[PDB]
């Protein structure tokens, strides 16, 4: 291995953060874990940055925490459609290395699992003001157990024992 | 601080000499000759150089402004916006609003090149930079990053290049003519200074050729004479040198050339011998495809008045000039050698 | 590297917990008061520590002699040491930081508001200890302390 | 810091944290909506404290404008509209004067008598709504004696101060003589 | 913190001289209306800075010596008082101060009472070497909680240390 | 002072504050308008202290100035439209004649016979209103002798000149003699 | 004036009202004149500080009442014939008086960064010997030669 | 005892920020590497160089996340060495990579060592090295290749 | 050998402990003019003088002062010090032609032991 970061130097990257959020589906969804299997299969078919993967699916799992129903969504009136929409600044603790530069670049994601609809505009910051953490944005409400629910998106969580996760990796190779 | 200072039109040169420094300093770039000039060692044939390294430093002794920074900027500004700050000398020196526009258009494009965005930043009216130039730092740092990157054409950053190219060979208007002279004719250097006369071209030609300035050297300070503030007065300007300028200029003109017909007259310097010294020594590289004594005798055979036949040559070589503009050589050529 | 630590601190509070109705029960007010650092701007530091002196705040809640709208009010200062299985932490210093979340539990709905002045202390007389301020396993746990010696924090778990 | 890498040695002028006194004349203008009144300048606090969530204005006045704003909170007098059931309670405010604040925070740039508006909606849970601000700090370079800055706020309101002051994001401290000097903001804001 | 009383107590002895004058709508029914009234004199300050906490406590020993004109159209209040004393304070090293005099006015409007005040302060410091009474002798308090409680609203505080003198530790305004 | 910095020694012509007599003939001409009468004189002090606010004019007129404002304020006679209900209560005062003022200022230029109007609104609370003033300090070389300033203040008003002359911002002393020698202005002012 | 003084602060309402203008006396102070040659002097020596549009006014007390070496560097520089030979062409021999008064060795004319030019702001002498009222025949023997070889400054003075 | 005046201008770039002085001494003392200014001043030079690593105070770049750290040390003045051929008033630059593991980056120097004939007393050039820095000045002299009455001596290099 | 001392600091504020004092004075030979010989004495004069270190009754900035009298030229210093904290000048006298102690930390702080300086 290398000299400036061995196998796992951590590493804090603040960076802001926007997400719109739309899903669509036969029935409304029940439970949390029903919500995070039909948004997990976002990126089935990965056409954007590679970059910006590890957190476009931190942002996908913040969207599913907070998928605010719609009218429609009520006993029968027509199709369930959701909707999220979370903005501001935060900084991820994660052990991937230094990562690439990062631009405000609006990036839509149109795949399957009824259908979804994202845009994420992950970009860097090189302000000095202090930003929220990434995984405090996630309300206590829902994530009872937030490990399994934060790693079944594709990543792999590890608590500090500070209560500050950190990311490990996502699953191999995606 | 400069990017919502040119947004309000109200920026400090403090301000964007300080970006400026904190934003070129690319030490990247391998030499690979020394770079030796006046004596000065910038670099020795392989080691990495930066814009400011062929440039003394010093902190600047003064009260800073305030400044109106924007925090929501990220780090997309070494791309264009440097550029854009040195592109606004060049199109704040020109003083008039057509070549402005067409300055203007022309950073724009080159800009838009790099980060394809690019909102225009300084306000259409109230142009701010032409004060940019009075500043002393802010020349320093735009002939140095001129001539840095004159060196390493092939740089990545050699996009720098629009705005500041119009400080190298700054108020060298004279020198500039006489190249021009010497490649127009085909005639050596060496043997053009002879044909020279008048006795004020002679001492404007001893003034600017100085043995000790180097002036065949690309790679050196001097063509950033004023920029640097090595001087300020440079002998190789058009106004310290009218005479022999006036004289190239219409010599040139006189022998079909594009450019000698923009350059302007200059002002309260006796034209008539000029004159007919430009139109004897036009005369002989186009009537003759050269010997300066010879023609002199030839002259002297007419007892000093051009022949008819040497005005219908001036007037071939100037009839058929439109778009002339005014106060300039070719209207003055125009009016009294196409009678 | 993830041993206990005898840590000093003197610090300050004052809680305030409004709401629509009055509080019944105290694991409504747990669940009105977990919620106060949706967004953290505080550092990070001082995350543990703040989270020990919400509960020794919210153990500590006593309504105004008021009670418009039901407002419930505390303040403790003191001195105190905690133990730990946190590892190293940076020094503290003597800062005091305010905090806001609104909450939305239900049927409780309301605002917060802190100051909180964690301060390190060199002195070496003994000085008494964190969690006989109480007058509790469970009341950490759904504050996200885990357990008297701390072991970690478990936010939104 | 020091304590971490090599070679950060304070400068000579200020030592750390040199106290001095800057005199300056300021004027204010207040405008704040919302849905339903304010109940208590607690809320008022919380919902003027995010007027600078992307700031562009000035930069050797974001403290004197944060306590612009904090004096502006304090005196935000209600309208007519404020009244039962009219519309959207429009808050208004207006102070000018002259005054000197004692900091901490290092010597300033100077600054220039030039206004500008600040507009920006807040949510602070249960209530909405947009400000509208408009700030005239500059200093002044009389010699005639000024108030003090933090004695602009009535006693009235404010019950404590050195927490409706870091709501809006400062840091206070007491010199123990009757006047509030402040440290610095919110942390690097 | 420094080694020679940074912040420890210190005993300044100076001359003084009051001059006091309140006037408002209609008659003071409680001391803490008149309390309220009196502590708003100093919304904006523009007199010598390091002589304020001074300020305060004369302004103290003026509202606790407030008797009502024979007149009481609108009652105004007034006293008067002209002392030597010491005074006990925990605020560290003080400027010196001069034999000048200084108005002042600031309208109140507590609710209930509006008026307008009237302050005249002579404090300056002296160097003679004679023993001179306390300066909290002036008062006719209820040792317990009288002078401990309109002292700390007017914004001063007061504290034991068990010898029977009481002590000046830090003033406290908007607060 | 000498205490805080070296080299501040003072010149040997006036020494401190030596005593000087500055005979002047003046003119003055006043209008107070308000919103109600005022009920004791010194709410006039109160409402006529702040007429420099913003200063614009003399310098080395700004003492006597204040002084002749004083003087005019202690013969603001009423006008028949402060009766009962009429309009808003109209003051004016007038005063004309040769005066010479003991004071510690130091030496004054040389005035000159230019007249300065004055005009800015007040606000002591209850209060509200504006001013006027037109006054024509200057020199007198004449050996006339003239009256004593502070004569021209009636006793039947300013029951404690040492105040009612100090709310201006002037500070006030006596020359042990019945004399009342002008100490200087409000300090720093 | 107004032109180059909004190009700084961008207010700048005038100043001095339209009519009665006071400046005029301005010249007559002596004391006046040598501050504003000075700050002439210091910005003609350093062209390129930061405040050098203070050059705006007192640029006409450089070379202030001494038109006669005006004209005579008009002439010099408007027929190319060297100074060194036109002084040789000088004739009716008080031109040739007034060649000789002006050319004292020990005046340091021919150096620009020198107290020469403003010999009568600073006071150095209350006579300009190079003025043209001192010098009438040279200024007009040379300023009309300078008209006849066609120059445009060679018609406006008196 | 040499008496000479001097002048310094020195800027060391690194990927991270330097541990300590240690280290600025190993990413410094490889500046000589490869050897060409003046040959007769290489133990001069190396003392200078070690002056200007004890001098080496740094920019505002230096803080948590701006660029890469670049520390700079300008030092001017006169003094004597215990410890030549005649040195004369000339200035040479410097540019060397160094590789010190965990370090990477480049150099900048100027040196302007000479003689001075004048009489005027000077400082010990070894008095130059504040006391805060340089907790074993033997093992400091060391890492640059100098071999070392109060008053240090220079042996070699 | 006979000499003669007066000494004199000053900082920004009072210091806390010695152990300031001393950090405080070790910095006033950064370039020292003096003779080298007198250098090892100078340092134990230096010493001695901060050993009596008694503040003037006036106790502005606070002023340190002492005194204490105990070839023959006599050569002044004055070296500004920054440890941080405590920052100001110094002013030395020193003549050289007593403890009440401890001391062997204190002085060998100063340089003294042969005389170590800047160790």
């Known amino acids: 291995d290398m000299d400036l970061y061995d196998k796992d130097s951590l590493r804090y990257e603040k960076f802001r953060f926007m997400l719109k959020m739309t899903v669509r589906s036969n029935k409304p969804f029940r439970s949390y874990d029903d919500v995070t299997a039909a948004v997990s299969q976002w990126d089935n078919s990965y056409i954007g940055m590679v970059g910006k993967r590890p957190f476009y699916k931190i942002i996908a799992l913040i969207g599913s925490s907070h998928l605010q129903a719609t009218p429609a969504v009520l006993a029968d009136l027509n199709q369930p459609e959701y909707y999220a929409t979370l903005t501001g600044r935060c900084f991820l603790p994660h052990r991937l290395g230094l990562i690439p530069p990062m631009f405000n670049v609006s990036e839509t994601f149109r795949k399957p699992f009824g259908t979804l609809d994202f845009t994420f505009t992950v970009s860097d910051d090189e302000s000095n003001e202090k930003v929220p953490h990434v995984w405090e944005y996630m309300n206590p409400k829902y994530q009872s157990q937030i490990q399994k629910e934060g790693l079944k998106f594709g990543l792999i969580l590890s608590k500090k024992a500070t209560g500050t996760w950190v990311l490990d990796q996502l699953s191999p190779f995606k | ?10 920026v400090s040169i403090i301000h964007v000499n300080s970006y400026l420094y904190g934003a070129l300093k690319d030490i990247r770039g391998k030499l690979d000759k020394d770079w030796s000039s006046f004596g000065i060692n910038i670099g020795k044939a392989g080691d990495t150089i930066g814009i400011f390294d062929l440039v003394s430093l010093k902190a600047l002794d003064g009260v800073l402004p305030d400044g109106v920074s924007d925090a929501s900027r990220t780090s997309a500004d070494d791309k264009w916006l440097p550029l854009y700050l040195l592109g606004l000398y060049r199109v704040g020196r020109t003083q008039m609003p057509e070549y402005r526009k067409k300055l203007m258009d022309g950073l724009t494009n080159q800009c838009k ?33 001129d001539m840095f990157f004159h060196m390493f054409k092939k740089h990545e950053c050699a996009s720098f290049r629009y705005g500041t190219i119009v400080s190298r060979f700054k108020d060298c208007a004279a020198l500039a003519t006489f190249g021009h002279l010497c490649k127009i004719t085909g005639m050596s250097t060496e043997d053009v200074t002879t044909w020279i006369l008048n006795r004020e071209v002679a001492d404007e030609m001893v003034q600017m050729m100085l043995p000790g300035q180097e002036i065949d050297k690309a790679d050196s300070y001097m063509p950033y004479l004023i920029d640097f503030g090595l001087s300020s007065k440079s002998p190789y300007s058009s106004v310290k040198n009218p005479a022999f300028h006036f004289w190239g200029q219409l010599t040139a003109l006189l022998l079909r050339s594009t450019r000698a017909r923009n350059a302007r007259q200059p002002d309260d310097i006796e034209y008539t011998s000029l004159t007919t010294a430009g139109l004897l020594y036009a005369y002989a590289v186009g009537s003759s495809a050269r010997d300066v004594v010879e023609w002199l005798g030839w002259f002297e055979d007419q007892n000093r008045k051009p022949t008819p036949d040497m005005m219908q040559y001036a007037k071939r070589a100037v009839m058929s000039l439109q778009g002339l503009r005014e106060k300039t050589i070719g209207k003055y050529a125009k009016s009294e050698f196409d009678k």
């Open chain 2, 1 to 10: 601080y400069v990017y919502q200072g040119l947004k309000s039109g109200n």
């Open chain 2, 113 to 145: 090149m790099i980060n394809e965005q690019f909102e225009p930043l300084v306000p259409e009216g109230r142009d701010i930079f032409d004060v940019w130039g009075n500043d002393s730092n802010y020349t320093k740092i735009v002939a140095a990053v």
